[PDB]
C-alpha cells in the first residue's frame, strides 16, 4: 500500500523532480522499519505529494 | 488492559478522524517496549483521547 502509491503520483502527471525526490523518500522509507515513528510522518508527506 | 483501552475506543462514541489513528498507534504500541518514555507519552496520548 505504498507500492500502490507508486503509480498513484503519475495518474496527473507527475513532473521530474518531484517524483525524483519522491524516490529518494521512498528509498529513505524502504528501509524504516514500521515500528519506526517516521514511517507515517513520510506516508503523510507522500499523500502531500497527492 | 491494552484490550480493555480497545473496547473503550469503541465505548465512548469517539468519532471517525480520530479512530484509525488511535486503532494504528495502539498497534503500534503493543510491540514497542512498554516502558520506554515514548511508550509513556503513548499511554498518555491514549488516556486523553479515551
Redesign the interface.
Known sequence: EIEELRERIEKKGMPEPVKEKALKELKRLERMQ??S?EA?VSRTYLDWLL
Open positions: 514500521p515500528g515513528p507515517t
